[PDB]
Amino acid sequence: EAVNSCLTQAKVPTDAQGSQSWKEDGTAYNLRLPFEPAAIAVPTTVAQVSAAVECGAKHGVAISAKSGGHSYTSLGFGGEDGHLMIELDRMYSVKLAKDGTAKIQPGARLGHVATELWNQGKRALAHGTCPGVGLGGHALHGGYGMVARKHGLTLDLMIGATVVLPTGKVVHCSKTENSDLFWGIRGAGANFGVVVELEFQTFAAPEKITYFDIGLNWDQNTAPQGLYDFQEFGKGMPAEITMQMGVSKNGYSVDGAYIGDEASLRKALQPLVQKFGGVQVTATTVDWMGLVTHFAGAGVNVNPTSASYDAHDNFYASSLAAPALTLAEFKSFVNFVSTTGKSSSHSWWLQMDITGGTYSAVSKPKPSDTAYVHRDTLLLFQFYDSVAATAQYPSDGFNLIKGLRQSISSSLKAGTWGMYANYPDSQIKNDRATEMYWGSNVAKLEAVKAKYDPKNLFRNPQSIKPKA
């Protein structure tokens, strides 16, 4: 590699091909989708990120930044062999300021973000539950978690960013400075260079936040009206509730979080309990860091910073951003789950999240206000199929997950639905993926791309192509 000798001569730290250091940074989270970079740069400073980008641009090699490496389709590698991969997980600084603003390096994992903001000032951001997820990939495409309906997606509290452009030039952007770049980073942020700092307006970390679960005993006769009643409750429910429906061969269960105490949560859910019949709510009030710890899972490191991070799964996933569904659409879905899902040997599961409703912060911005387009949808579905670490993923798994999703999406009006770039689907056609993830924002994203990455060095198979 001329690109490797360029990096060494620019005093950019790199991993030697085939070494233990290469295996540490260069093993994709998803064991189904390993990739072999041309080079792995391991910068500790913004100056080293600039030099690494300049080296890639000079040699015409595709460049991919990897923060936490949780991409379901290994897009931090580029979703193919041969990129210059810029490993960012050595840069995990979280700095909270007295005015409640925070400057965070994207290589900080969500558990480290939550731990540092909690300990520095009892502050928080609206991010998802896995603690190992990088804040870079998460916030640049959305970031949905247990307080989304009150505080928005992670990117809804972003107020600034620092980006290494594909020239190596370091720029600042905000609503008031390079606002076109700042728009694109807030939902399509892999496309425009390496983000090396994100600035946010934190919120006060709740002293009292209640997690809750509702165990259900549904079948093909009760599940359609139960899912419809769940959805209808979600449309009107207060911003303090974020919740989801989990579904697998084991049946149906509600889980969520409520900003407030247990008594208030039980009063707020009583109409949904009355819709269902014969259910009990389980609920526990904790503080914010208690809530983060609870959803991390038993025995998971809630504050991961080590370069030796090595979480893995072996899986295929897909998603659906959907408007409100009819009860007939829920019947089609439950029919698929009760027949094809029930008889499947696969360990599949899905979540149906309420992202919208009258009071939701996620559905407050218009679709065009950020690159994140799915502001008009009520539901976010995640579909997941996993096999053991030492199994090969079977191709009938693609058809199982496609069938689960299409049991809903094949009945929806064209242009009213899509997919979530944080839950990317490897099997979709390349340009159909760009429309699923960014919808009506694609045209403006292509113009931003033509301005900031005209040579399309920051590319992957599902990424935005430059068009002025």
Ligand SMILES: *Cc1cc2c(nc3c(=O)[nH]c(=O)nc-3n2C[C@H](O)[C@H](O)[C@H](O)COP(=O)(O)OP(=O)(O)OC[C@H]2O[C@@H](n3cnc4c(N)ncnc43)[C@H](O)[C@@H]2O)c(*)c1C
């Ligand atoms: C593994 C995992 C993923 C989860 C989990 N829980 C989630 C949740 O509760 N809510 C969510 O909204 N999402 C959840 N996800 C999915 C993650 O949000 C996505 O998997 C994120 O994309 C992961 O981010 P990260 O770990 O940083 O992944 P990478 O593979 O490094 O990058 C993803 C993507 O973004 C680009 N990129 C990263 N960093 C940068 C920077 N600094 N600049 C530019 N571009 C960047 C990559 O190139 C790639 O395209 C729970 C679990 C267990």
